[PDB]
Amino acid sequence: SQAFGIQTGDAVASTITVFQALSIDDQLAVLWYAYTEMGRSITPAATGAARLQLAEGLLNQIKQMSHAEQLQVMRDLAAKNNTQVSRSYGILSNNTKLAFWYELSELMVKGFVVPVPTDYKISRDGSQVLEALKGLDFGQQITVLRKVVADMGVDPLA
Numbered sequence: 001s002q003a004f005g006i007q008t009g010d011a012v013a014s015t016i017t018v019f020q021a022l023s024i025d026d027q028l029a030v031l032w033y034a035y036t037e038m039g040r041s042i043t044p045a046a047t048g049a050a051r052l053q054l055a056e057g058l059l060n061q062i063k064q065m066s067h068a069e070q071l072q073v074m075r076d077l078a079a080k081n082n083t084q085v086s087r088s089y090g091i092l093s094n095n096t097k098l099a100f101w102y103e104l105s106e107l108m109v110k111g112f113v114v115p116v117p118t119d120y121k122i123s124r125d126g127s128q129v130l131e132a133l134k135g136l137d138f139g140q141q142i143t144v145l146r147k148v149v150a151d152m153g154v155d156p157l158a
């Protein structure tokens with residue numbers, strides 16, 4: 001094991017790194033396909049963290065935009081563009097950020113938020129990241145997803 005100073009490998013840390021190197025479009029698609037692959041285990045009431053005053057208002061703000069505006073908002077989050085939505089997002093706690101993305105997906109399933117085109121093709125790199133995440137256990141999956149969405153938006157101490 002650790003007797004020559006070697007590390008076998010950090011599956012969680014490495015998945016986070018390759019995810020964050022993806023294009024913005026691949027990031028959003030991979031997040032969506034992660035939701036479809038764990039949406040059963042995680043239950044719509046098992047969240048208990050998107051009905052807080054902070055997240056609820058941002059979700060309703062996005063819900064009212066046009067589909068084109070909604071997509072631009074999520075691209076801006078992933079790209080860390082300094083906009084009001086990105087600033088509001090960045091003051092959410094990390095679990096609230098996770099619950100926020102989960103509720104966006106539920107709103108897409110319900111038809112209130114722009115859907116993922118099923119003819120959007122994830123790139124080779126994106127497919128490799130999706131496969132890596134699907135090969136992690138459910139607990140490592142939570143850890144990766146939390147870090148990846150935690151870094152989105154604008155840092156309030158930026």
Ligand SMILES: CC1=C(/C=C/C(C)=C/C=C/C(C)=C/C=C/C=C(C)/C=C/C=C(C)/C=C/C2=C(C)C(=O)CCC2(C)C)C(C)(C)CCC1=O
Pocket residue numbers: 024025026028029031032034035042046047048049071074095096098099101102104105114115116117120142145
């Ligand atoms: C339109 C369009 C597109 C659209 C792309 C789009 C619209 C993409 C949208 C993607 C979205 C909104 C994905 C959401 C994913 C949510 C996940 C993985 C949530 C996991 C939650 C977890 C693990 C939470 C767990 C829990 C919670 C909640 C707690 O708080 C407590 C416990 C725990 C922490 C475990 C493209 C960009 C694709 C192409 C161009 C184009 O036109």
